Structure 1
Amino acid sequence: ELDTIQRVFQDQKSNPPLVRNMPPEAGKIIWARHLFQKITGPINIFPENVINSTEIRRYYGSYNTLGKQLTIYEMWFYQDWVNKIEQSKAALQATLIVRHDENKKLYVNFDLEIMQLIREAKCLDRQGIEIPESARIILLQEDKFKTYYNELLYALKEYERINSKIKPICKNLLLPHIEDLDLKLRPGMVTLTWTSMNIESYLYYVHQGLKKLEQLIINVNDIIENRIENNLKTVSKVVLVHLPNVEVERAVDDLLQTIMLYPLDPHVDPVLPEETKRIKRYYFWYFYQALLNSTQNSLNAMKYRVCG
């Protein structure tokens, strides 16, 4: 051994590589108790046988004298631990925990409270210790906060993926829809996760807005990404010299088809996004440049291969 035990204790619990899911407090006291038990066985063984011788015782012582020391260290650790959580909750963590909200991402206010209450009950149960009523009530509430924080996490990021897929094109039909997807939260709702409701419906409604937007994008795709691209390819293949009206008619039809998707050819008035609307016209001009270039590319091809 137990001088060997002594050197073990002198190298206290914070110094070795403990790997587990048990707090420093709990691991420290168990190791001390176990060490004391081992001691021891051886121481127881030684014684018786041885014682006687013683040696062882011485050783045882150392161990013990070691046993006395260990008991003293245990008591100091428990002095810092017994009653600590009750004081923390009753003073500054039990006072109507602000739920999780957002501005640019999800902002976690009481992350510490979640983690702490978590470790608290797991360790008190595993160690066969009594858990005060205050700790159990707030712990169940914490589980509610954690689940809602995670679900809101998923929601926010849904808006993020949709954004990652919209921003590469910067279409001024979805940019206004994106603008319309803005919401406002008053302070009276900053405490809804207490009785477990109105946040599920809120998140579901935000999701409903996102899915409706997604459906609009799906349409815009089916109308624009396939039919018009195929038409452009047809325009490029047209041999203007020889080959053994239609595309022009289809181009006109496709314009009107795009107009049917609520694209703001005039700037939206109340919003006044004069700068934002011309961006799609620039991309559309690039597409128009691709159409004229398609015919032009053909033009040059014939001009080069006229001799055969």
Structure 2
Amino acid sequence: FIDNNFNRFREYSLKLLHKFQSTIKRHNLTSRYNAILHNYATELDTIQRVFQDQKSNPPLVRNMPPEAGKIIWARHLFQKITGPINTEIRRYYGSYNTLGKQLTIYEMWFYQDWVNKIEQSKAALQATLIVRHDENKKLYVNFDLEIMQLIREAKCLDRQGIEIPESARIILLQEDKFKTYYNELLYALKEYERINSKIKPICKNLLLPHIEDLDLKLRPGMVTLTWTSMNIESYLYYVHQGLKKLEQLIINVNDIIENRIENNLKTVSKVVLV
């Protein structure tokens, strides 16, 4: 019965201690210690084979950046190898042959990545507010993916509890803001596109200098702000005021054309006078 329980084990290392409490009352204790150490050997061997296959292209957590994910994984493995350890010296050597590696490699890993990513993030931050693609000829948000990447990493490292450069923490403290602005902008542009679709194609020439009024109010908001302004939240207010003034103006125009004039025109077309 003890042999069958050992085979199912190779979680099980925890279940073995519960069995050994009942056996503790009565070389039966040595054989149990050996069976638990064998279950530890298998788990260490399965980790050892995995760490030599995955190291190259590991499996990360869901929505994880490539740098901080490759760190967390190699520190997840560290936390799993240091469970079993707590003749009898040989089964510690082979494990310390892993724990000796992970840190020495996956800390040289960390430094390499994070002196190099930060200088490239901060520059990419101080980069106007929005940029239109000359080919598109349409407004588009200029928020590089590398900043959201850094921020999400700087969160994930604080959660597992590793100490972060103060530079990368300043950005993470502010984070809550840089999401609320980015959201408010993406709404503004989706509202601007929606507004320029409501306008009927007969009056696009007519109402061009009103679209070039709103656009002109945006331009100082585009280039002068450089994202990290004192009063960005002041600018987003003037934009939404502008869009509301263009809405109420378009809705007036669109209402009289869609309802008053076109009904009177339709009734004339179906008037028959016979």
How big is the shift at 1:92? Answer: 9.3
How big is the shift at 1:8? Answer: 0.9
Q: TM-score when scaled to structure 2? A: 0.61
How big is the shift at 1:18? Answer: 3.0
How big is the shift at 1:143? Answer: 4.6
CA distance in 1 between partners of 2:223 and 2:195 (Å) = 26
Alpha carbons 1:100, 1:106 under 8 Å: kept = yes
Residues 95, 181 of structure 1: alpha-carbon distance in 2 compared, 3 angstrom cutoff: closer
How big is the shift at 1:4? Answer: 1.8
Worse-superposed segment, 151-160 or 22-31? 22-31
What SS does the aligned partner of 2:216 have?
Answer: coil
How big is the shift at 1:60? Answer: 4.0
CA distance in 2 between partners of 1:134 and 1:233 (Å) = 67
CA distance in 2 between partners of 1:180 and 1:94 (Å) = 25
Residues 99, 40 of structure 1: alpha-carbon distance in 2 compared, 3 angstrom cutoff: farther
Deviations 1:87-113 (A, max 9, x none): 975999799999999994445555245
Deviations 1:143-167 (A, max 9, x none): 5344323322222232211111215
Deviations 1:44-98 (A, max 9, x none): 6xxxxxxxxx487288447636744664344444554478647975999799999
Q: Which protein is richer in helix relative to its size?
A: 2
**Unpaired runs of at least 5, structure 2:** 1-42
Q: TM-score when scaled to structure 1? A: 0.56
State the partner residue of 1:232.
Answer: 265
CA distance in 2 between partners of 1:131 and 1:141 (Å) = 15
Residues 200, 77 of structure 1: alpha-carbon distance in 2 compared, 3 angstrom cutoff: closer
How big is the shift at 1:125? Answer: 1.3
Worse-superposed segment, 122-131 or 21-30? 21-30
State the partner residue of 1:27.
Answer: 69
Worse-superposed segment, 211-220 or 189-198? 189-198
Deviations 1:249-297 (A, max 9, x none): xxxxxxxxxxxxxxxxxxxxxxxxxxxxxxxxxxxxxxxxxxxxxxxxx
Residues 103, 209 of structure 1: alpha-carbon distance in 2 compared, 3 angstrom cutoff: farther
Residues 145, 130 of structure 1: alpha-carbon distance in 2 compared, 3 angstrom cutoff: same
What SS does the aligned partner of 1:71 have?
Answer: helix
Alpha carbons 1:159, 1:210 under 8 Å: kept = yes
Alpha carbons 1:86, 1:134 under 8 Å: kept = no
CA distance in 2 between partners of 1:96 and 1:165 (Å) = 26
What SS does the aligned partner of 2:229 have?
Answer: coil
Worse-superposed segment, 177-186 or 213-222? 177-186
Alpha carbons 1:99, 1:193 under 8 Å: kept = no
Matched residue count: 232
Q: Which has the larger radius of gyration?
A: 1
Residues 115, 101 of structure 1: alpha-carbon distance in 2 compared, 3 angstrom cutoff: farther
**Unpaired runs of at least 5, structure 1:** 45-53, 242-308
Deviations 1:17-68 (A, max 9, x none): 4342443333333332332343344456xxxxxxxxx487288447636744
CA distance in 2 between partners of 1:202 and 1:73 (Å) = 44
CA distance in 1 between partners of 2:128 and 2:256 (Å) = 54
Worse-superposed segment, 122-131 or 64-73? 64-73
What SS does the aligned partner of 2:101 have?
Answer: helix
CA distance in 1 between partners of 2:235 and 2:190 (Å) = 16
